[PDB]
Amino acid sequence: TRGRVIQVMGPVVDVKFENGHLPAIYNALKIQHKARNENEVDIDLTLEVALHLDDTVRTIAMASTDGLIRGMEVIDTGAPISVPVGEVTLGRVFNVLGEPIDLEGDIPADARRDPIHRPAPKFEELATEVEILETGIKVVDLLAPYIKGGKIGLFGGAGVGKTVLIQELIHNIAQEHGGISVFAGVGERTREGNDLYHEMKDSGVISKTAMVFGQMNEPPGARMRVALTGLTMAEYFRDEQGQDVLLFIDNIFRFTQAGSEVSALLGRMPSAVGYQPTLATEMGQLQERITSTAKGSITSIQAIYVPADDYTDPAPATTFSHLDATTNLERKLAEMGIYPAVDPLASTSRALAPEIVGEEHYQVARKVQQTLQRYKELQDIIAILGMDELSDEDKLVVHRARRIQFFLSQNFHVAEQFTGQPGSYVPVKETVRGFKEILEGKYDHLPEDAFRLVGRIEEVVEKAKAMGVE
């Protein structure tokens, strides 16, 4: 089971196994070559079979291909890329190859490391009744409920607290739901990545999560597989341990992007906008693997960078088709001191129907939005007629509206570090009741700043007498 390199095209390598052996598609092929002279370079490089082209195979190198010489033998590992799984991966940061990139040591040869390429659950294995995932985050559980076992979009990334959210999420779930999280950086900005690591070190949540980094500096192959690698680690705790896990994929766009890049070197015919003709299908076999089987479930938060704020590009288009809800982080709400900075209007959810939450959540939810729309449109007038005239109703709205969009903030567990406030996990039930009443106006006498950064509706009370009210 030994072949030799025939062609090297950039990240693409063409191995040739003389007869009969032929490493099955998706199998990982090692190349370990020690420099045999002063005119060569050490090589430790792993490949993944793509296609059989005459007892010839083509491959996509996960790492650089520089220093490769036609004829170096390639070694079929007999299996595709396989990465470690279990409590072993928790707090550990690996790379595409499931090799720890941290300084905390290395994975034993005892460790079970499953493959990165597997088919999604069988039709008879999925969840029947759609069940919501409580995040204890007011904004979410109310206006944009996460479907436990779905794919949530996270738009906007720059100074919005995006990280707290991701972090806080990892925290809440693993706290009230007892599950792991797996952060997967897929080809976007080493710089941001290094920071998130430190923040999850500080937040102490990295104890509860396994990380993988495929960053924007790796070759097509890596970027293209990282999502799978970090994925496989997540599936473990579902299938094996029955847990509801959370798989974060920062910039899943790089996945389908890196895809087309190679597709050209493989030889696939260009498709709509140069994108690999396989596009939709690649994205499917990736996404369909994320759902809630009989036993556990995996819910994913993906961050999508659209190609120049254009929502018709094949890449985003294809992704949205798997999205079950969208969480928008606006650079506006933060300024106003409303954390989380989730836009209460833009964030939508599929599970926001009375069929899936019943009326009281829905009725309340859609209401809390409407009242917010009024306070929005009126903004123009406010800046024209002052607060003097608005039909003396529009005021009542602007009253409740503020209390409401203010009460949409919260005490974040991962904010205790710089604030000291302990933090809160307000359930959907408690959350619905709070806005219910705030909507009935039974709070209209408590100063704005009372609902601002708190818990359940009671915490606004104590925050209040703390103001001095009877």
């Binding site: 099955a24 999604a120 969840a127």
Partner: protein, 477 residues
Amino acid sequence: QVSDVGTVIQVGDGIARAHGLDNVMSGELVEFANGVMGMALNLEENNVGIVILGPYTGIKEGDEVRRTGRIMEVPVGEALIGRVVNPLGQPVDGLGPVETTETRPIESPAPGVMDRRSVHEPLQTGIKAIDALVPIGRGQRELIIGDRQTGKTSVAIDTIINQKDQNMISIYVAIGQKESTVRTVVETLRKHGALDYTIVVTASASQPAPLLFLAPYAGVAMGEYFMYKGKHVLVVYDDLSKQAAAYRELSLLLRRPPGREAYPGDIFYLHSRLLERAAKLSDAKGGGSLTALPFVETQAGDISAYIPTNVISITDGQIFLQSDLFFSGVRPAINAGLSVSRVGGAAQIKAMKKVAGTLRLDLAAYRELEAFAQFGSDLDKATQAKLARGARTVEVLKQDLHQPIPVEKQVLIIYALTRGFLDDIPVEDVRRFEKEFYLFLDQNGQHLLEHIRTTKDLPDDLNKAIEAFKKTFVVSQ
């Protein structure tokens, strides 16, 4: 024998070029030594492009490829009804195999010009918006085009669920759709009891392109059975935009010369030769029907996109679902403006035919008018009157989900507002009016709505006119 099998040259991306098979028919099933099936598409001089239907990893070079001598046919029978199977007919619902005697080939010619009879017999969608403004008769083809998360699926579902008393044996073809959804959907059917008449053919977004490609035709096949019997079928191809795409992939892989937007030259032939297979068989043939509901997912709502355009021109009209309407909390998200049903009106029953004629009007003007309210601070003219029942009709056109409406008590509410028997009631109370005006009838007009059934007419006009007051004159406010 020596020819009738071949050996795999190249493998990857669901495609296999094999040697041999000198006798494979273009469109013949070919089995791989590994058990995985496939299909011959490119019959060239030195080789044959195959599209692997199933896992293509368990396939390497040199693997044998042995013919079948069958053109891609599929199970057909009275036992699929209630079962969830893939485009191959292979049950995935995990309850036993499908025991059927007969079979029919996927590829089949459509009923001949003569073979059909102009559609007259309707399809009751149970959706006020549809079977009033954009009516659909059996044997017709109504393309429901719209951007993701507009309700396209919802419609098809509630439609099916509306097929219990009607005689309709329903078939829901899921292409590219998340197997997740298709399950939660096949279930909500389970609960409403749609499975007693409803067939489900799925190929999810995890399944290989060739299955997606085959799913629609595999669907019509199973339908065609009940049609050529004289029974009535309704096929929902959910998302041809994806299937048509899956073909592009598959066809591009066989390195077929790509056309505009990469789609193959026959991409149009693809859908055309598919949709036509739904029609109304002439009485000479048992007067059967197969009605087709093609979905087209739209990006940004660009109706000018290549695929969405083809199918638009193919169908008999379409139903365009606004992206914004849907959020503003207007369900269904229908756009009465662009939504049109060409076969329309022969599909509607007299009892609708009348109270529907004016419905388009009131809604028409309101569409061309209510761009102006905020500037209407000066609200002027009688243009206020057009809006009047206009904003009210919209309320009546808003329907619940999972709650179909029988024509009987439907024509009555589409009557009320169009006669003014609604107009004295503010929009706030329009929805929660028609709600008990139904019950008020299910008890006290239960006689009136009957004449509506057995005659499909209201020549009624007099009684109801007074009989409608019997209600408003007891309602709350």
